[PDB]
Structure formats: structure tokens, C-alpha cells
Symmetry: D2
Subunit: 337 residues, 4 copies
Amino acid sequence: TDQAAFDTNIVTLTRFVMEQGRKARGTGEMTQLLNSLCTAVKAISTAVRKAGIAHLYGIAGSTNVTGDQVKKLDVLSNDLVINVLKSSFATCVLVTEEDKNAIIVEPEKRGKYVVCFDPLDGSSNIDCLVSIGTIFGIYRKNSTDEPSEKDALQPGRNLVAAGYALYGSATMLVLAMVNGVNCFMLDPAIGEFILVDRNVKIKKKGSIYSINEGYAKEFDPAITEYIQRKKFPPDNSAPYGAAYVGSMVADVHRTLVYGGIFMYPANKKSPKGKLRLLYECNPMAYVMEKAGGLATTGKEAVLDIVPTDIHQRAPIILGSPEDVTELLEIYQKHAAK
Amino acid sequence: TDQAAFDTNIVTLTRFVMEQGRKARGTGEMTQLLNSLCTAVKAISTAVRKAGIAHLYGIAGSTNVTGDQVKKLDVLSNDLVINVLKSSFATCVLVTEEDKNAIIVEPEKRGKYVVCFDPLDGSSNIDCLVSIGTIFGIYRKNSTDEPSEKDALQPGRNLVAAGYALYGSATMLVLAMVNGVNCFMLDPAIGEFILVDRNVKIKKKGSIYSINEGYAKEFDPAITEYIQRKKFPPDNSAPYGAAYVGSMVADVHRTLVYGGIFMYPANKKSPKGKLRLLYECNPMAYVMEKAGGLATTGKEAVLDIVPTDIHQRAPIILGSPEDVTELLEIYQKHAAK
Amino acid sequence: TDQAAFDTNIVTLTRFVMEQGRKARGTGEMTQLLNSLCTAVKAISTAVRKAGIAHLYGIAGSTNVTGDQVKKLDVLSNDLVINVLKSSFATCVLVTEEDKNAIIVEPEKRGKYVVCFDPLDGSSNIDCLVSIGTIFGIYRKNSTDEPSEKDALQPGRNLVAAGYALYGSATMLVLAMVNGVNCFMLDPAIGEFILVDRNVKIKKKGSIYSINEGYAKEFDPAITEYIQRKKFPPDNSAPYGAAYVGSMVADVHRTLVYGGIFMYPANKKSPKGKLRLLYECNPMAYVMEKAGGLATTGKEAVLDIVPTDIHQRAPIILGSPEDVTELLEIYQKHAAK
Amino acid sequence: TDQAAFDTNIVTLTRFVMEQGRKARGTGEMTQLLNSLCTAVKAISTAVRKAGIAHLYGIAGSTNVTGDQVKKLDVLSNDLVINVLKSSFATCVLVTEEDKNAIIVEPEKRGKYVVCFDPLDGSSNIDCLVSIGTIFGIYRKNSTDEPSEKDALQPGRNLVAAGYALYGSATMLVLAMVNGVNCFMLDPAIGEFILVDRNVKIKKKGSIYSINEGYAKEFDPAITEYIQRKKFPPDNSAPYGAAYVGSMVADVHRTLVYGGIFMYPANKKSPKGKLRLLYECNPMAYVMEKAGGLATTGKEAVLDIVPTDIHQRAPIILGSPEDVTELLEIYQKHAAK
Ligand SMILES: O=P(O)(O)OC[C@H]1O[C@](O)(CO)[C@@H](O)[C@@H]1O
Ligand SMILES: O=P(O)(O)OC[C@H]1O[C@](O)(CO)[C@@H](O)[C@@H]1O
Ligand SMILES: O=P(O)(O)OC[C@H]1O[C@](O)(CO)[C@@H](O)[C@@H]1O
Ligand SMILES: O=P(O)(O)OC[C@H]1O[C@](O)(CO)[C@@H](O)[C@@H]1O
């Protein structure tokens, strides 16, 4: 249909819960949440435009000496991305990798929305200005009793909203709850978030794939098989392209468009991959599923584990329900016993 | 005291009610409000950097032909500054000058916080880039029954938060409720509001005054008396300075600092002045009082009238409790009968 | 369907100064210290507007630093300029307010220009948060001599252009040249003082006087037996309004975009006015007479003054041809005995 | 107490190019089309990043505009550049991608430079929202002749500088000159490509190859019987990782700030590579060999190519001295029969 109108309007993130929220007859408590992170999708959004060199220590007021000499900004990100959560007065179990374990919230600033986020999708190789941003997750807190680190030990299948934050050039927060996916391209001129492509649905026939191809030898003859099919497509087909930003997001957000498919299991160096799942190989996985995007580990659906530790890691391979789920009959071609 | 610390923190506006709000054991409903205006203290904040010439029609997507040929942006301001209020789902009586009368809110997006604002402190003479911004007001809706235009007919004395928005260079939202005043200097780099001088208290001994001195002849021998005292300070004193931006804000925000005092009654041309009080000669008046700032009309305390019409206008003279209230014994020197 | 978004042939100051000097093979060295002056102004806007991430607000504590009575933003904003400029080499002589004695740029550079200015005049009135600005002229000199203070000593009728801005609701760099009055507005999207306000000439007999009537008893016989003239135009008709910003910078702005009577008479502390030739008289006033707006001092004029000190208070008095000629005629007639 | 806030002697690109050319009286005309090229890039960052107030998103409707397969941001971003540039006069010759045939700038201007470029290469990969960029070289020519296509036809070993940027997590304008590799980062606070990343040279034998292994069956004998070499370095040790951005621009970036093996071999649709001399080979590759990083094509090199068409696909293959020499040695040895 065609009628893309003129201005006098915007679509923030507040409105998304401010609106849908009451339609669910509630408190607007679920919302006390993500704004603090919305406020973050801009906060660090811009930190990297500067993160490069003469911008951080001194030239920004950085004095909370954290680390040995391998970082500080990263910690500074989450360093306000912590109490900000307390500033919402509704935080329960503030789940964060930065800390060995979470931090159980004080009697006062407590709710029933356990935020489980990665305060940084390993920006590390920030020296190139690649596609990175924020990460998060949450549960409507299943239990009741004095919240210990505990409950952040919950599957995405019983998690109604796990998510990231992509600052490419476009700071665009794709918010999604237990119903669909929706991106909020920000507007700095107005320091305001603005939705853009109303509702997302995972594509079905891609053409680019993601995993690390720099890694031939060590990989397995089951994954190093799905590989063959792209390179050497079998019944007279055309070779799958690829672009590996390296990132989980910057490749698992391409998936949100054109046609990408991450592949990343036990890299042999590591027994499961490189994503500390509970706020790594999950937020994305969840967002795709709502969108009708079949997420998984290759040997297990990413949203269905008994979280055997907070900072536990895991694999994720998702994209085209024909292409990413194609690996079933690849893992199922390599069938020896 | 001295300990002005380093970074890793910010003080928005959300937090002010998100925080104080629960300390009042409520819904966070009062807050669904002003964010939409917070979102505005930035929204138009920047409209004037452009408002000047090659920025508006076409070059911004302006097509909702309002007026004869004397404006459009102004209407465009409030043009989104309207439904934005509906986007909060808690709006009752959206009070706005732009319209002859308010607009009574539909059953759905209704609360118990009647927002009474001036969507524009007569920017008109925008051709100079002077000190202007937003305006507002609100009541915790006293009645109950089907809200007609009605209730926006309420005194500031039974109004717990009337306010403006000053974009000088510094977009700084001084929020205040029934308890004190607090300004939120924005940060565009993060499109985020940031409080600055914790708590305000009206000064007591100024040195600059505001009213229009271009107007000798028509003024009265009671106001054209307070005048004498400044020009010709009596018992061997020094002449009061002045700077009349022209604006109500840009002079009644100076009052918030250094030492100003607006004077502005029936300009004779008009029977009460030029401020359509209920969202003009009031927001400020109220903000000063909390701060221990004695507001008034000269012949009546600005926060105590039976609102004899929505768009009704009125006078306001406030500042130093010795200086602005000095007029009592001036109005009281000119005592004839 | 059709697509429309923005300007793709933008008129950058760089682009008018790169094509305006073509009247006679402009050499291509004017904009040298112009785009090099530029960056400074461009920058200083967010001083008053922003806080970086923390400015004077937070760093040590509320220490009683009463040993001086001048803000610190006054040297970081000055040096910056005195530093961005010398790098284009074109410098010759230097004179400011936030400095002392004539400082120069070695015969290891040098070009042909003598910019006389003030870092960001007003400063203090940014505390009351007014949208103030800054005066700043430049010189194309006649000298084989090594930069003595006697070199800057030239009246307005001998400059190349005068310039200033006002970081108010968008900075607008303003400069006067052989062809007239332009007005460059600033795009923050890219940080750009673009020509979006071409030529500018005011209204012949503008109904708006200008000055702080609070100084009533301080001015000489003219202005006074000249004030009520405007108060109630002897012609019985339209009396003058007043939007006297309060801060000198805009005292010239608003007026310009209109037509009014701004000025400064010799009072008590000012038996020679107070707004220095080299930085008030020759820039803004050179902008003015050249704008087609009469500019005055006291009895004499700015376009003809030679200081003893590069910091010599030369009065100022300006507006529309009729608006000010009336007054110089006031003087004419006020020759008295 | 002490006061600290920012830099007050900033190193503007304008300021390095205004002082770098002093090696021998730089004439002061280099930065002419440089600050005039500048504004364009400076601008184009918010194309991908912003939407003005509305871009392609909202204006008419989702009309099936399938008559073409190239975005519209491709001409507003091009023209803009081809328009900001001609205004400095210094132009000589013009060659792009988003245009056709040699377009020039009349003998009513002209200067000495021939900037060959692409408006914003990548475009499309901004839909998937990747932080892409743009290649754009410039020429200081040898010609008494009237601008024939035969004039641009010069290899890299005959330029004055090559340049590009990547509007990713802050645009960084990058340009190579007689003295080496710099890296100007962009301050949006004032819109400034400043020198905050001085000199830059990579790691000698960088453990990170570069290219889309998805193209496996498409490249010539070298890369292939060269791939597993890096997969498992014959030295048994450290195998190469891969952060192949996916988009050519950063395919040169990240690498640079590290050390890797980026390249492009002649495949099916590319029996002459695909990344044109005048805009891929001579800019970025001139940036490279001059960066101290071996740059290649196929058998021959970029620094020595003469096109039939100003749009002639010249392959590209580059990285660290050891990283690529191994490969040109691969060719050496791969002389075969
Ligand atoms: O090892 P690679 O291929 O460079 O991938 C980068 C990895 O680092 C991270 O940023 C971890 O923080 C992951 O999300 C990501 O998978
Ligand atoms: O008439 P003056 O002195 O210029 O004052 C401007 C007036 O216009 C307004 O902006 C009205 O919108 C008032 O708030 C203000 O008092
Ligand atoms: O009220 P006063 O004493 O005339 O001071 C205001 C004037 O003085 C200044 O401080 C300097 O001229 C300006 O900002 C303004 O023009
Ligand atoms: O996966 P492919 O087919 O090699 O395409 C990606 C490459 O092509 C381009 O589109 C042009 O080189 C670049 O962005 C990138 O280097």
C-alpha cells in the first residue's frame, strides 16, 4: 500500500510500552526498565565516536581506575549502566558479566523484572569503528522470595524480551516483547528514539553466512560440512557469499535484513563457542524467534537449557528457516555411529 | 562544602519522578506526563536553530497548511505537542491556547493530570535567536466526572507543578513539584536531560528589573512610581539596571539567578497585561513561590483567582521578596481616595 | 515516486568566501584565517550550550575562589581562538580583552591579517543563561613595520570585514564586506556556518529604541531630551517598543533583523564610553554603518577613531538612518553654549 | 581549585593541512578543495546515521520503484560532493561511479586538482546497516591540455594524496601524503575531522587474512593454494583469525589499525577484478603502499595502471609486508607453465 505521510510525529520507545503496556492493564513497571537502557542506546552510542584515542581519560573525566591496563571505558559503560538500573527503583536481579556474579538488588529499588544484559558485546576490536552497540535481556521474575543471584538463570522460552542495541551509523533499538520485533532508529538532533520498519519476521532464503572461516583445521566434519554446501553448492548451485564483521550482532542483525546465518559452536579451543549465552548467544536468538526466526545451537535450541551457571556460554546458528535449519539435514548427513 | 566528583553518572528528569514518585507510593502516572514534554524540551529546542529561514517547509517535511501566512512552525510545534499527550495514555484535559478551548480527552488515553501549557511563549520575534523555549502546567485533577474543558480552570495554589523550558544555548528544564525547584540542563550528545543546581530558592535583593520601559506615557502613576525608585533611587542609592529580552521567561529566568523582577500589569492598551495567565503569567509565578519567590499581579497574588475563562490573561510582578514585594509600599505610597 | 531529502550544493561560508573574493582574483588567502577563526566560534557554542561531559560543574568542589571575579570559560575559549588562528600563519597582530599587550605570530608564518576581538563577550550573562555572543573583527594591514600597537590603531573605514556571532538559538556568524551584509547560520549536523540568510538591510525608521533605561541619570543631555521623543512620537502616533536583550551582542542583532535605536552615552564610570574601538567599535559598528545602519559614538563616530591603548573604550550608538540621524541631529541642534 | 575542560589549540584537518604543506611554501591552495571536499563527507555521515527529519522513510508510499536497482541517497550524496567541490575552483577533472563521462569545472575557475571518487561506496550495505564508508582520491596534474579522459589516466605513483572515510562509529577522514599515514577523527560537537590519531603503520606479519571465503571456487590458483597456508601456518603455530567487515571500505580499515591480508582475485564475472583504478586502486591502495602496507592487483600492481575507461576494474590485494610478499612470492613461484 502507499501513503507514506509528512511530518508532525515520532515513534519513541517509551510510547511502545507506555502504549502496549496499559493495553495489558498493568503498572508501567515493565517500562521503568529499558528507558534506562534507551538512555544507554544513546549514552555509549556516542562513546565510540570518541573511544578511539584522545577521548576518555581526563578528556571526559575518567577517574575510577579499573583493571590492569587492558580497558576502562568498557567498565565505565556498565559503570553507570549499573546504578542506572537502581535509578529505576524497579530492578531485581541486575545480571552483568562484568561481575563474576550479579548483584542482588536492595529492598528499596526492587521490582519483578530481572534484567540480564551484556553491557558490551566485546567491543574490544573497537579499532576500526565496526558494527557494535548495547545488549540486554529480562524475565517477569518467576519466583517470589528473597531474590538471590538465582532467577537470571532463565531460558529465553520463558523470557519475554531479550535484546541488543546496534549503533552502526544508525543507532536503531529493535525492541520486541513476547509478540513481534520492532526497531527504533534514534534521532540525536532530538536525542530521541524512533521506530522504523513496523514489525519484523525472519527471512527464509538468505545468501551470506557467518562463523569464522579463518578456522578450517580445528572445526568439525559436521559444521565443516554446511560449509561445503555454500562454497561448493551441490546440485549445480551458486556460492553463498559472506561478510564476517566478527561481531555476533553485526552479522546477526544482517540476518534481520538481506540474508545471513550465524554458525558458531564449540570452536574446539573452547567447548561451546564464545558467547556467554545468558546475555550473548541469547538476546538475538530470542528476537529472531518472535520474528519467526529459528534460533539454535546446532545440537540444541538456544532458548531451552537449564542454565547451569550465570556466565555460562553456548552456541547459536540462526537465520533462514530453510537455510539455518538446513543444518539439521547436514548434522543429519554426518550420521555415523 | 567541597567534593565535586568525577563522571559515571547523569541526572535526567525521568529519574526525578521515577524516584520521588515511588517515595510517594503511587503509579508513576504523574510521570507518563512531562516525559512527553521532556521529549519536547529537546524537540523544538533545536527547531529554532533552524527556524530562521531555509529550514521548515519542504526542508523538514512541512505540509499541514495552517494559518493565513503569519506562521506554521508554531502550530507545528504544538501540532505534535498535541497527540504526544495522547501517546501518554494518561492525558485528561489537554489545555492549549492554540485552540480557542482545550480538547477533552477520549475515554482511552485518560488519566488524572490535566496538562495546561503554552506550547509557545510567543516566540514570534524569533528573528534574533533570543531566550525562549517551552511552557506548561498541571493539576492532579480535583473533580471526577466526565472531564469537560473545565478543570484547566485551576489556581497555581492548588496546582502542584507549572513550568517552562528554557533553550538559551542551555536547554535546561527546571522541574519543580509541590516541594522545590530543580533545573535539568540537557546533553544533546546523549539527547538526555541533566539536572544542574540542586534546589532553587528565589533571591532576596536584586538589581535589574523587567517590564517595558519603552512605555512611559500610557503606564500608571503607581507602577510609573516603582520605576522612579530604580531610576532615581531616593535616600542616596544606586540606579537599578535592566535588560528586557522582551520575553516573560528570558527575564523571569534571570530572576532565578542574579536579581531580576518582572513588572507587567494592564498595559492600558490591554486591561491586564499580555500573559494569558493559565499558561503564561503562571508557570513561572508558581516555580518562584516554591523557591520562596513571592509572585503576584500587583493588585493580586497570581496564584489565587477563580479562573473566569481558559485563555484569560493577567499581570505578574515577582523576584526579590524585598524588591518585588517592595511594590506593596509603592502601590501603598500612591494611596489616594 | 519522487524522492526529496536535502541540499546537494550547499553554500558553506567556505563556499561564499571561496567565490566572493573572485571580484578580482581574490588570491585565495582571505578564508585562510577565516575557516581557521571559524572552528573556534563553531566550537565555543557548546561551551555555554554543553558541558563536554563535565565542565565547571563537578571536578573538585564549591571552593571559595573569590580571589578573582571572572569565569574560567574565558581563557579556554580565548586561547583556543588565539591558537586556532596563528596556525593559518596569516596572522599579523593580535588584540583581545581576555589577554593583554600585543601578541603576534612569528615571521615563520604571518600573512596579512590582524584579528582584534574578545573570546566570548558576555560570558557572565550566560550564568543568568541569556543567549549572548561575541564581537571579533579582522585586519588586512598596510605595514613593513614589526607589529607595534600603533599598527592595529585604525578606524573602521580601513578594515576588510568585521565579524561576530551569538551562540544563541543557533550561532550565526556575521561579517561585513565591500559588498554588504550577509548572515551565516550554523548546521550542527556537520557544524556549519552556512549562508542561509543572504543580504540584510533594516527598516528605515524602526519603531524600537534600545538601551537600559535603568541608567536614566547617567547619560548626556541628548538621549534624555531624546527618550520621550520616541516614548510618544511627537507625531502623536506609533510609540516605540523595546526588546533590549540586555547583553550587547544581541543589542545589535534583533535590531538588525528589524530596525531600532541601540546606543551608549558617556556616564559616570564612563567619561569615554566603554566598548573599545578595536573590538566593539570597528567590528560590530563596521558591520553596521556598512549594513546601512547609522553607527555613532558620542559626538564623533567609530569609523574614525585612533586609540592610545588597543583597549580604549570608544562609545557606541546605532540604528536606522532616520532613527539615529534624528539623534546626531539632536547633537547637531544640541551644539548649545 | 584547578579548572580543566577541553583542548584550546585544536588540531583541525584545516590546521594540519595549513601547516604540513610548509615543507616548501605550500602555496596555501591544497586544502582549497580539501576543506571544500571535507564538508561533503562531514555531511554524508548523518545520511546513513540520520534522516534529517524524514528521508526515504515517509514521503509518498511503498511504491514499486523496481525500474532501477540503486538507492536514491546515491545522487543527493554525489551531486552534493560534485557541487561542494567545483566551488573551490581548484577542480580540473572529475570521475566517480554515481555519474558518467568526464565532467569538469570551467576555465572560469579551475585550480590544479582531479578528485576521482565514488559518492558513498557501499550504500546498499547500510540497509543491512553496516558501518560502511567511501573511497575518494585527488590529483595534482601535469597538463596544458583541455580535460580529456586520458588526463585522469595516471597510476598511484603519481598522485598528491589519496583519501576516504567510513561514517561508522565516527567518521575518520583518511588521506596519504609524501610524509605518510595520518588519520583524522570527527568532532560532531563542531563537525570536525581532527588529527586525533597521528601517524599509523601496521604489524609486520599480521595474523589475520581478509576476503569472503564464500567465493572459494572463484579465485585464481594463488589465494587458494595460499589460503590453508594461513589456516594452519606451516610453522604449526598461530593460525589467522578473520574480521572481514564484508564491505570493502573497512576491509582496508580494521586491517590497517592491525595487520591483515585483504585482497581481490580475478574470478568469473571479474576477468579484470572489479575495483576501478581511478577510485579504488589509486586512493585506498595509494593510501596503503604509502602506509607501508604492500598493495597488489593480480600479477602486477596498482601504483602502475593506465585505464581505457576512467571506470576500469583494476583488482586489489593488500596487507603487511610479510603478509602480502608471501603471496606475491606465491605468484613469483606460481609463474608455472
Ligand atoms: O572471535 P571473533 O570471531 O573475532 O568474534 C568476536 C566475539 O567477541 C565478542 O564480542 C564477545 O564479547 C562476541 O560477541 C563475539 O562472538
Ligand atoms: O510585548 P513584549 O514587551 O515584546 O513582550 C512579549 C510578550 O509576548 C509573549 O511571548 C506572548 O506569547 C509573552 O509571553 C510576552 O510577554
Ligand atoms: O545594565 P548595564 O549596567 O547597562 O549592563 C549591560 C550591558 O553591559 C554589558 O555588560 C557590556 O556592554 C553588556 O552585556 C550590556 O550591553
Ligand atoms: O560477498 P561478495 O560477493 O564478495 O561482496 C562484498 C564485496 O563487494 C562489495 O560490494 C564491493 O567490493 C564490497 O562492499 C565488498 O568488498
